[PDB]
């Protein structure tokens, strides 16, 4: 007994009983009211696992610390619509985030270039530009890799001319007029090109001088890819493939400090894949086929630099590790760039694929189809397994016709035929 009382033993409580004995009787009676339980009596090692389970009731490792997003659960939150401040009057044919600034560019058959300041809560419009008689099948930002001060917007539609809008210095906002230029000279190759509607912009390093400048790629009538200088517009070289050109994608392969080569990837409906070396007059350097490909519709690369994840200087140039190939049937073969055998054959979509785009880190593949409403899924990479929680039947997507990932922050924009750009934010980023 740690402690003893002196008062209880001395005091005599009438029924006269001494305290300590009287205390013992009180202990007995309460022991009668409730039985004594067995737990009170009780007072590398193998019992480590048993102990640790007792310490905590939360057993899922926290995803905040993990730099890799969970495979199957996507933490995605909807934000305000981008077009809410100023709605469009036609479908959103293309989307593009500015490489560094927080701007989202929209275009369509409205013939209007609407640029919005994406903040997620207000989404106001910065400026607008109407191009009379020039539908916009695709628009995109461009930032010169060497002169960071050079911004530019290139736009094209079902026309034999292309429009370039300079945004350098204060032209974007302060200027009361827009400095625009029309590219309408192909220098004797007009037969190959019927329209500028399908075009992309990339960086070409002139190796012999080490100078780096932008190029504009176009789709020709008969497997022709015409390459033009971004600023001067001169015809540099042309690449030819066999069969009807369906789509092409661009990859960068760094060589050394300040040296990289620009590889053009083109695909035929057969899945026959051509790779031209644009630093060597566009000579073929590899040929292969899409395993089990037929009715190919789209091709894309990512995990490094690309049109959706442009670089800000030479040293950020990185090689894409992933390559996807869409199809009319709804299959999306995936290839690991690190005849090839696809890593996986994604088949959740059952309609023609129209948009394939990777995340800036190359961890997510978003495929969408314009054929049917809500045709959009997100695949976790390299697991190649579709996310389940999102999208749901209650998710408003409509006829998805444009998709874009922000360079940073994990923002997703999805436009539809109704002219609404809906914005979502990935909590992991």
């Amino acid at each position: 007994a740690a402690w003893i009382d002196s008062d209880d033993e001395k005091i005599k409580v009438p029924i006269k009983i001494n305290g300590v004995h009287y205390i013992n009787r009180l202990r007995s009676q309460f022991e009668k009211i409730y039985p004594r339980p067995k737990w009170v009596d009780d007072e590398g090692d193998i019992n480590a696992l048993t102990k640790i389970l007792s310490t905590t009731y939360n057993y899922k490792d926290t995803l905040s610390n993990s730099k890799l997003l969970p495979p199957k659960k996507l933490d995605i939150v909807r934000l305000k619509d981008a077009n809410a401040s100023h709605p469009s009057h036609s479908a959103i044919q293309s989307l593009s985030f500015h490489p560094s600034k927080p701007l989202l560019l929209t275009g369509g058959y409205d013939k209007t270039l609407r640029i919005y300041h994406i903040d997620g809560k207000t989404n106001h419009l910065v400026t607008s530009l109407h191009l009379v008689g020039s539908p916009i099948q695709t628009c995109t930002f461009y930032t010169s890799l060497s002169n960071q001060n050079q911004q530019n917007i290139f736009t094209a539609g079902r026309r034999r001319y292309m429009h370039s809008w300079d945004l350098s210095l204060e032209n974007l906002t302060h200027s009361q007029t827009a400095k625009i230029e029309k590219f309408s000279r192909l220098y004797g190759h007009e037969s190959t090109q019927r329209s500028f509607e399908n075009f992309k912009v990339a960086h070409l390093q002139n190796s012999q001088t080490n100078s780096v400048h932008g190029i504009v790629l176009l789709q020709g009538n008969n497997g022709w890819i015409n390459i033009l200088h971004s600023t001067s517009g001169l015809w540099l070289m042309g690449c030819k493939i066999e069969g009807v050109i369906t789509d092409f994608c661009i990859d960068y392969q760094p060589i050394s400090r300040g040296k990289f080569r620009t590889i053009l990837i083109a695909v035929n409906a057969y899945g026959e894949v051509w790779e031209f070396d644009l630093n060597k007059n566009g000579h073929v350097i590899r040929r292969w086929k899409d395993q089990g490909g037929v009715g190919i519709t789209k091709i894309q690369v990512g995990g490094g630099t690309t049109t959706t994840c442009p670089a800000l200087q030479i040293s950020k140039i990185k090689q894409n590790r992933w390559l996807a190939v869409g199809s009319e049937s709804g299959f999306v073969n995936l290839y690991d760039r690190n005849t090839p055998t696809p890593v996986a054959a994604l088949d959740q979509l059952t309609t023609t694929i129209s948009n394939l785009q990777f995340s800036p880190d190359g961890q997510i593949l978003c495929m969408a189809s314009r054929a049917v409403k809500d045709a959009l899924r997100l695949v976790h990479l390299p697991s190649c397994s579709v996310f389940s929680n999102w999208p749901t039947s209650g998710t408003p997507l409509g006829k998805v016709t444009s998709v874009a990932f922000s360079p940073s922050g994990g923002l997703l924009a999805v436009g539809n035929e109704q002219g609404k750009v809906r914005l979502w934010k990935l909590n992991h980023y």
Binding site: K101, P102, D119, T122
Partner: protein
Amino acid sequence: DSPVLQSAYDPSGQYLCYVTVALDKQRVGVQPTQRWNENFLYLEDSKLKVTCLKWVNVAIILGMNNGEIWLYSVLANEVTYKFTTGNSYEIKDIDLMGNQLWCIDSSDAFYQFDLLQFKLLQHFRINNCVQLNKLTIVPAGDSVAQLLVASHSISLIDIEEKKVVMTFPGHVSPVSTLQVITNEFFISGAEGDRFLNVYDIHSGMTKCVLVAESDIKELSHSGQADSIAVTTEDGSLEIFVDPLVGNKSKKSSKKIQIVSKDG
């Protein structure tokens, strides 16, 4: 809603510091009111947000939801020093008088900081303060002897006594502005309210109730009760001329609006 989450003129009124959201990240920028600067401080955390903005006489103190206070020198475009409280609760308000620096957390804990020494001097809790949405230091001499605090009502507290001294019936809604116009005369305003209560510190009686045409967002005072300029939620600026001279309720005398040529 306006893209500018928060803003505050410098005491001279020549430089404006504002905070806006770029994509998912907040950026803080400064512009010269009298007459472009492309430099903005970028918060690397989407979760991090700016709760309080206060100029210093060329540094600006920024209250973070993280539970710490950042001192920002605009010229260097870098955070010179961060004052971190023990708790992680967001800072609700900030005020300064020279080296003195007082802030309040979501726990309603008062803190005292020294700019010169870079140290947390004292922290304390006062009963009868269930929330503290506003903190204002009374301009008494060169030292702090009392503090004006308001969440729904307004309370006066003595630093040395660590107790409330006087209480003023405030607005039903949370108090938004608690500027002290002159001695024994401080104006009060609440969110979503068109009424400003002018209270006498020494007595505690409502001297006047100033009325705006619409809900008041911001308040600016000229001289010593010479005039008060209030920004209305509708986007118009109302000016009150000599509000401290029927008499209980006064209306704005001059109204200023901005409209484009197109309309």
